[PDB]
């Protein structure tokens, strides 16, 4: 069996990698943050309740100016809100009514969407004529789209259900580099602050850090018991947090290349749907299937508060660029802004 | 400048509200259906009679709008994209008549899924012609795969369709109770299953899904008033 001998030597390197990771873990983060004073109880009330969507909200993305946001639901409707005054700006009908993602360009000119059509539809908001229409339909993915994020007006990174991620070119419509290596559906991704790198969490209970330019996976992070539903980079850009179905939120380190902390409770048994950090990274906000959002101290693993205002499970959570507010959209077609 | 900017914003919001309300009437009028098979189970015939990962099909029956969505080219793993189909009226399950055992496992995993607890499953026992000729020819057998069939007896309430072999009548109903065994074992009443012995050539499958959809709505309305 010439195939078997390859596995025997391959697992030795995996064993060697395991030994290296444990050697670098001289001391855990719990002892290094034992003397830090706790943040204490925090009160956060829903300042605004954005309503108007018909079907369940599946994703949302804050604007780069901390004012507008785009929310996509399962009725084929894209709504752009104004969080300050709660007035809709646009209502874009969708070709396919089974989208699971949306995005806001850093220039505020484009909005993308994708879902159970393997096609990432991109709309332009600053058209010369006046009405919002699809500018370019990016096709080439095999599985359903799960999360698409913008780099600039000419580049976009999309993660599909065919265990691959892509880096598209807007004008040409052809993907430049295709990222391979995942064994299961890719559910979420988050760009680094410098945009050089990005990680993606798939259904293999593993997160893989990719390189945007050369299209090669540098490091692989594992340790989760079940699949990963959402992921988010640390504000510093040298860490990220993953939300999984097995009801654990984990914090990883790029430089350490291993686990740092786990956020879990015996009471909590449902999976995590969305994870995001705060402005300073001290506060971690995680969504759950029990209709509640739990606020986790990212340095002490102790819950600081609970954001419970939704009648159904949350499927999207996002914190503004300046950290002034957090918007959590749930399956009850309601978006709430907490402050 | 606060007064000038707000004036245009209100008109846009009011105009969008009018357009959104109009589309809300249409969305609530149509009934969404999910056509799902066991893989090469003959479901292609149902969609035809009436690039892209989901095919959209709309047909008009008795002044009622239906919307059947068949998922094509998506990966075999349905554990992630099946949570979207938790607001559809029903799932039009098509089961080929091994292939039979794998059909039951997917149906059991759909019935017990937390999201698709409420959603009802319309079940079609298509490809019955091959099943009818399988027992008659004797080349292929099912009691070897399903040992309960030898001891199994024809149900009393079964209606004999004239011109059919009484032996194959037992085989057809045996699959129905095998699918109904899981449906009734873990059934809290929030959802139901409607087995149907359909064919690959009859055009009456449209009528069957029309009556079954009305049955679901009648039960849903009754339990909304706590009558049932």
């Amino acid at each position, epitope marked *: 069996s010439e195939l078997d001998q390859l596995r025997q030597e391959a697992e030795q390197l995996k064993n060697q990698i395991r030994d290296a990771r444990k050697a670098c873990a001289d001391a855990t983060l719990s002892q290094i943050t034992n003397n830090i004073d706790p943040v204490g109880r925090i009160q956060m009330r829903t300042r605004r309740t954005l309503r108007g969507h018909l079907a369940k909200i599946y994703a949302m993305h804050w604007g780069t100016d901390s004012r507008l946001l785009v929310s996509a639901s399962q009725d084929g409707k894209l709504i752009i809100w104004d969080s300050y005054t709660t007035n809709k700006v646009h209502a874009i009908p969708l070709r396919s009514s089974w989208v699971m993602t949306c995005a806001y360009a850093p220039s505020g000119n484009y909005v993308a969407c994708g879902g159970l059509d393997n096609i990432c539809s991109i709309y332009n908001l600053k058209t010369r004529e006046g009405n919002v229409r699809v500018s370019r339909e990016l096709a080439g993915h095999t599985g359903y789209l799960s999360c698409c994020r913008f780099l600039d007006d000419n580049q976009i990174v999309t993660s599909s259900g065919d265990t691959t991620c892509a880096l598209w070119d807007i004008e040409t419509g052809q993907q430049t580099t295709t990222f391979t290596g995942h064994t299961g559906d890719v559910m979420s991704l988050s760009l680094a602050p410098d945009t050089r790198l990005f990680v993606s969490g798939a259904c293999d*209970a593993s997160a893989k850090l990719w390189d945007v330019r050369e299209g090669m996976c540098r490091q692989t992070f594992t340790g989760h018991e*079940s699949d990963i539903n959402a992921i988010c980079f640390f504000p510093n850009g040298n860490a990220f947090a993953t939300g999984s179905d097995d009801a654990t939120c984990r914090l990883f380190d790029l430089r350490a290349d291993q686990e740092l902390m786990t956020y879990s409770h015996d009471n909590i048994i449902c999976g995590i749907t969305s994870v995001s950090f705060s402005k300073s990274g001290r506060l971690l906000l995680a969504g759950y299937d029990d209709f509640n959002c739990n606020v986790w101290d990212a340095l002490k693993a102790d819950r600081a508060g609970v954001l419970a205002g939704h009648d159904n499970r949350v499927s999207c959570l996002g914190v503004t660029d300046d950290g002034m507010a957090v918007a959590t959209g749930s399956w009850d077609s309601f978006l709430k802004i907490w402050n | 400048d606060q007064r000038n900017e707000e004036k245009a914003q209100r008109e846009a919001n009011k105009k969008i509200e009018k357009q959104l309300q109009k589309d809300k009437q249409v969305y609530r009028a149509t009934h969404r259906l999910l056509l799902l098979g066991a893989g090469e189970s003959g479901k292609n015939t149902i969609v035809k009679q009436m690039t892209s990962g989901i095919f959209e099909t709309k047909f008009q029956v008795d002044k009622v709008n239906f919307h059947m969505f068949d998922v094509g080219a998506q990966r075999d793993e349905r554990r992630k994209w099946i949570q979207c189909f938790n607001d559809v009226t029903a799932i039009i399950f098509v089961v080929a008549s091994n292939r039979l055992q794998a059909a039951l496992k997917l149906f059991d995993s759909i019935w017990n899924n937390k999201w698709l607890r409420d959603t009802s499953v319309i079940l079609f026992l298509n490809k019955q012609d091959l099943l009818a000729e399988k027992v008659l020819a004797g080349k292929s057998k099912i009691e070897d795969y399903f040992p309960e069939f030898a001891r199994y007896t024809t149900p009393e309430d079964a209606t004999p369709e004239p011109g059919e072999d009484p032996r194959v009548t037992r085989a057809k109903y045996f699959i129905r109770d095998e699918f109904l065994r899981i449906s009734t074992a873990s059934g809290d009443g929030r959802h139901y299953c409607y087995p149907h012995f359909t064919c690959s050539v009859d055009t009456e499958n449209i009528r069957r899904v029309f009556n079954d959809c009305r049955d679901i709505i009648q039960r849903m309305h009754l339990r909304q008033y706590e009558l049932l």
Partner: nanobody
Amino acid sequence: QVQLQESGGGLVQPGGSLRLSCAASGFTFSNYKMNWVRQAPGKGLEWVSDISQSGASISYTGSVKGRFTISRDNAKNTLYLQMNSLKPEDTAVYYCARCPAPFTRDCFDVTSTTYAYRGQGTQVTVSS
């Protein structure tokens, strides 16, 4: 990183009793449903049996109810499959599968062609 390497298997005479022990690591075993899946030569994946988290609810495929018995031990996180009265028809490679989510009754994609939480099967041969 979950990985399931199971022992047992190999060439055996017809009717020769064998046991298939599945070793689990990387995840807690007390709250995950377990399954057994075989791959017949020239055919697709087939489902054999499953056991609930508590070990009470046990279900088998049609052809192995009178031949196979299964057990699960949570103290040593090992899953066992017992083979009795084998025939040349059922020869295949047996994979020890795991249920994608905990604290749930449904189980999806166990028999899927590409599954992340599935071990490397051991080929068993029953012939004379």
